[PDB]
Design a protein around this ligand. Structure first.
Ligand SMILES: Nc1ncnc2c1ncn2[C@@H]1O[C@H](CF)[C@@H](O)[C@H]1O
Ligand SMILES: Nc1ncnc2c1ncn2[C@@H]1O[C@H](CF)[C@@H](O)[C@H]1O
Ligand SMILES: Nc1ncnc2c1ncn2[C@@H]1O[C@H](CF)[C@@H](O)[C@H]1O
Ligand SMILES: Nc1ncnc2c1ncn2[C@@H]1O[C@H](CF)[C@@H](O)[C@H]1O
Ligand SMILES: Nc1ncnc2c1ncn2[C@@H]1O[C@H](CF)[C@@H](O)[C@H]1O
Ligand SMILES: Nc1ncnc2c1ncn2[C@@H]1O[C@H](CF)[C@@H](O)[C@H]1O
Lengths: 291, 291, 291, 291, 291, 291
């Protein structure tokens, strides 16, 4: 049965990920380990959060998410293990993933285990949670953990025990909500008739530009598909296009497309060409949209 | 038991491949998903084709190849699913892969699913095909596909249904041969006694240079192992060596080797040193060979 | 539930690794193939050695390590397959990986198969071995091996037979110890009271700097945690810090940490910042430490 | 007090320019040699033309302009020496450089000597000429000219004779107008109401962007200072600002200024910040402007 | 007689400097124009200041310094022309430049003309001044100055009139001290027994590192030649060497030298090797020195 | 009348060259200072030598060459001043430079002043010398020279005294031939019928490749214009062309030209395209030529 989906900042150029995987198979012989990605900017908890927030709906119920960037490795800190509530960001207008009308996922069906450093901020915000525990029991972590490798000791190892059916509530004491570290999410400001945000990510390998201006932020301004937009990046680049569902709607190869990405965020790209790379556009640059 | 071998342009820096994998495991619980590669130049159909053309003889019979670069994502286009004819000859490369005399593969034993954009051109050229269908049935694709993610909606998802035993002929209507998009492959030309082609790829991470001039094109010119060759690249950057089976035949480390790569194409390298990188050699550069 | 742990210099940008995996599943249908890494500097046998030496204690007993950089591909050379003795770097007390007191591994529980080019030098040094054989039998390698792809022919293929239960002693004749190629490891020398070694690796993606100076070399010079050290790199760039167990011990983000890495070697880093990248520090640079 | 103003593509990293200067002082002992620049893109005759076209009005009457990029060096080609007619780009009213109302320059007061390769195209277009001669006399060029250094042999040397008072008409035979090589200057075209030109130069070291769109092209489309413009570069990157006389008119540091450069062409910049460098803007990129 | 020494941010890749020089020769036919440098970081008034502060002692009395970075070009601002008082930074213990005991320079013997933007801050601080005037008279600037080229209109042109003997006090009205724009010079902090400053410049082309910690700051701490220093750059690099007069005092090529540069500022270098380049050290990095 | 031609490693990015010039004009009021170049690789005596060896025949008789890279600055070393013998033959290059039959220069007509570090090795080799003196007299150098600026103190300053007519023999004691430091010049070797040398320089800004294989070395091998040559660079990167007088003889733009440069050395280029830059060719690479 069991699946662990594994996301880290460990990279793919040495044996760090393999050591974690070896231990997952040692503990839970029948496990399937699925890599999410291992390439996140080291120590960038906000970036790590983006790669793990929308996973549950895509995976079978009972999947465990081992998600780790651990700059506090070797300190007295301990990981948090949480059972999430709802698999969607939606649920009302479902938008389940899969063929047909998609695969509906039951509530309380996924566990995340992570450093208690805010990595799970958006997971908890979008999904809610039913229970959360500090990971302390020597049944699921080493008695003598390697100081420089808590991703392995405090995330990979216990994730496999959880996958093998170790009761969640036995990993350690319950954590009160305020004991779960969170980062602040800069809010999209409803300025004038415009919405002012940032570039949240460059979408590699395509060089598409993703903003933190969500479809729900747009709905709030009556902005829908077909609306002629001005999207200004870095303060000085007033891109102009209608909001369209996809890249090819821009027509000629290389033409600008303003669109909603697969997370429902306002994005901008060229049609089958890279927008970000030629002009060295970067995450953190300002993004303003108006109709 | 069932395997899906997965090749895309999605990269390995975010959760895109993982969303596809989650759904593959959801649809076909027993499946093994094997990554081919996810690093191809985005939208480069010809490059993608080289990563998938010679896979079948390496894989167990019944393997499904989910192969996708999807620049027409979100348009009315639909994927093609094809059952190939021969696993080897035309893509023999000796003949069968494996220990002893190799593993003979029965005809009609492999399915590819891909955008209908020419990605399968060389697969069909080298292997032939027995049947081909448009992928349209809501039993195997979403009713509301994400406009910007047809790699997931129109390839990953239906590949998993096929792996799970969904009948190939039920995915949609049969496609006539002319309805399968193909790209043109530039021909190897004869100019005097010399064969003129191009650098087809730089072989990373080694910096070996691979041309589109084939063993069969050399055999047609009376050229075999031992022949003293002059291989000019970029019109001006020439090289001279005998055609040898392997790198070490060049003698000293760094010496030039002209050889046949594992696909039987005329190639050039330095012995345990990078040829392409120090001189910034690139794909698309002209390549002329003469005896 | 057989496992093959697979380390190569083949990269992950083409189908080379996938060809190997396909053949592994062909030969041993119930196998799990775990990637160690495929990104090592091509032909660098010393670097490859570092990624494979400490794997056994993390993996279930019976795991086969297919480990290959093969610059002598297509020559009369043949691979070596060895069953190692001790899984840990320790004798009694062991230092075992996993939850609780870790998971002890029985002696003789792991097989490595590799080119006979010195890649296994440190594996043999740290673990010892019980038996070693030349890999020559056409039951486990191709009768007509592709000259430029011995990593596939002479490592991937036979590793899958071994995973499948093919008897190790039947792959070919026993090799005497002197017939197993070794590289020499450069000694940490003494310059008065200063220890003199090299930078053995830049620890990507973090930019931590690992030296070949071991805890044991430090102890003989009178150094444990808390000792004020001067660490000079490249005979130019000086750093000073106490030896601490981990990064956050340095205090402020960006502060210098001098520590022992997860393999017990003297290393240097910035706390949650890259040391190596801004100063363009590289492997092979001299490293001198003194109390 | 003769002056030679000297512009070449010879660079300033070796002794090439110094060899030319030595010979200038040898031939015309009282000369002052003024460097224009020596950094032009080698062999780019259009670029060289831009650095020399507006020089005469700044210089004392009788100045000789030695201007040379000479890719046809060592061929049977010979230089052209011309006495220009009008010093300014203007007729009556002139637009003279200097303090007060500027310094008027008499007609026929300046000589250019250059390869006959089109380098003087715009000088002749903007200034007209009174007389033109092929440079062939052994009184003013070497009898045995260095084949790879015609910039020295056929430009520097004869320019110094001319500065010294050698009669222009004696350097060789008169050239008819059709015998003076010209390049064609690409026309600013019309796309509806938008003007369409190119980026003619990146203005180093500031990263300002100069277009080939002239004030006169703008006037015919109904545009003077204060006009709100949309300027699109490279068919991708859009900017919007009023046309202003100078950089600081943009307000804040970093703000976009669209202005007319000191040669009267439509240009774009950031105020006391580089525009071109962060976005990697280059010469030859399309430039479209509309009111 | 007259000399103009010319320093600007105009670069040496186009005709901007030449246009200024042409006009200088037009106005003052007997002038010698000496380039200081034209390569300063555009708009960086503090950097420009460093290239012009120590010039007077090296030049004949009566020399005019035309010094210009003019980001306020085209505004209502006007240049300042000042007669400096003392040619030295010293005078007491002379340290005149030249052979023998050097060339003593009379007081009031040099004029600077510059934008009134703080470029002359250090000139006025180190030398004092006797008179200062706003440059407004149409006898010495154009009646219709080119908006984008005040370096030419408001500095080069009037500098030549001044060189030709135009009375300084006739350029325009006297400026009161408070009307002369100045920048703040971050002070070297006498912390503990240490002195905390910054890297003021990387000394190209050598890659030596210059600090703003002056010889007089060192004298204040009893630091002289022979003192064993710890110089920490960027917070984390405790360089250690005695203060020595020159590079070769460090011994072996590549060894660290801590020294006083030719302006009397604490500097650090390698002996006949670049310190700054290999480790990408930069201006603005912190610099702390202690004995 | 008097000229100083000035070559250094001081660069053109700060006021170092200008301080030298100021003093030259102070000491010798009538002087003209001609820049050779200031861009040489710092401390590279062999490179500096190439920029100064062939200057004399270009300059008026009585010219002083102030040539300095001074890594031993601030040591007890003292400069050497030498009067050379022959201006040309041995450095003829045809013979005399200039119009007609060129300008014959009398023997003993040029003085070089330089660090005694081998910078003048090839000057003395090609021109011979009549007298040489150590530069020690306080009449021509400072009594208290700046330790880090001997380029100024021990070259610039005394060069100006020499230009001003200070007797050469009064600068200090005569130096015996053995007291003049020389560097070793690697010899062009014969290997079979082929001549083996090195790339002596990349000819910036063109990317031409210059070797140390001379016209005389070719003339000794029976090689003249028209000879079909094979020129291999970096041991592996070979090229084939006839020896031609100039670039355009190669025909099409971009075609390979093998030719003799203006110093008579075997060189290779592309016709009006850069050879060195696209392929990252560098000085010090091996160069072998055969007919
Ligand atoms: N230099 C570092 N500073 C802080 N944390 C680091 C550093 N290098 C690696 N790490 C963290 O170690 C964890 C291993 F468990 C990884 O997740 C890194 O974030
Ligand atoms: N900017 C883009 N233009 C056209 N297609 C794109 C672009 N960015 C991503 N894609 C395609 O989306 C598919 C997801 F399924 C990927 O295969 C990309 O080819
Ligand atoms: N250019 C090369 N020289 C020597 N060995 C090479 C070269 N390119 C690839 N290889 C080796 O081929 C093996 C394939 F099995 C890889 O492991 C490479 O080390
Ligand atoms: N983009 C610019 N913003 C502000 N000033 C600039 C810009 N580009 C050039 N300049 C200034 O123009 C002056 C010419 F007189 C130069 O000194 C530049 O500083
Ligand atoms: N870091 C340096 N080591 C040795 N010599 C140097 C260094 N930096 C500059 N110089 C020499 O100082 C001379 C000034 F006259 C220059 O010619 C440099 O060669
Ligand atoms: N490789 C070259 N091809 C054509 N012309 C060249 C090349 N290298 C230098 N030159 C020209 O030589 C002239 C010397 F007078 C320079 O102006 C270059 O344009």
């Amino acid at each position: 049965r069991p699946i662990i989906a594994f996301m880290s900042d460990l990279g793919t150029t040495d044996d760090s990920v393999a050591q974690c995987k070896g231990l997952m198979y040692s503990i839970c012989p029948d496990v399937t380990v699925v890599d999410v990605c291992h390439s996140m900017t080291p120590w960038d908890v906000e970036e790590g959060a983006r790669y793990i927030v929308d996973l549950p709906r895509f995976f079978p119920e009972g999947t465990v998410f081992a998600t780790t960037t651990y700059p506090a490795t070797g300190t007295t800190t301990r990981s948090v293990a949480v059972r999430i509530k709802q698999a969607a960001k939606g649920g009302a207008r479902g938008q389940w993933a899969g063929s047909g009308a998609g695969f509906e996922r039951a509530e309380g069906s996924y566990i995340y285990i992570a450093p208690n450093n805010g990595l799970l901020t958006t997971v908890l915000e979008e999904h809610g949670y039913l229970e959360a525990y500090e990971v302390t029991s020597p049944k699921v972590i080493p008695e003598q953990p390697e100081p420089t490798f808590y991703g392995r000791e405090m995330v990979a190892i216990p994730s496999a025990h959880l996958a093998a059916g170790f009761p969640l509530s036995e990993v350690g004491r319950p954590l009160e909500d305020h004991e779960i570290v969170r980062f602040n999410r800069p809010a999209v400001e409803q300025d004038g008739e415009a919405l002012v945000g940032v570039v949240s990510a460059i979408d590699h390998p395509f060089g598409n530009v993703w903003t933190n201006i969500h479809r729900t932020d747009l709905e709030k301004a009556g902005i829908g598909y077909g609306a002629r937009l001005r999207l200004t990046l870095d303060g000085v680049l007033p891109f102009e296009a209608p909001l369209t569902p996809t890249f090819a709607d821009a027509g000629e190869i290389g033409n600008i497309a303003i669109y909603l990405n697969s997370r429902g965020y306002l994005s901008i790209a060229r049609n089958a060409a890279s927008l970000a790379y030629p002009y060295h556009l970067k995450e953190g640059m300002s993004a303003r949209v108006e109709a």
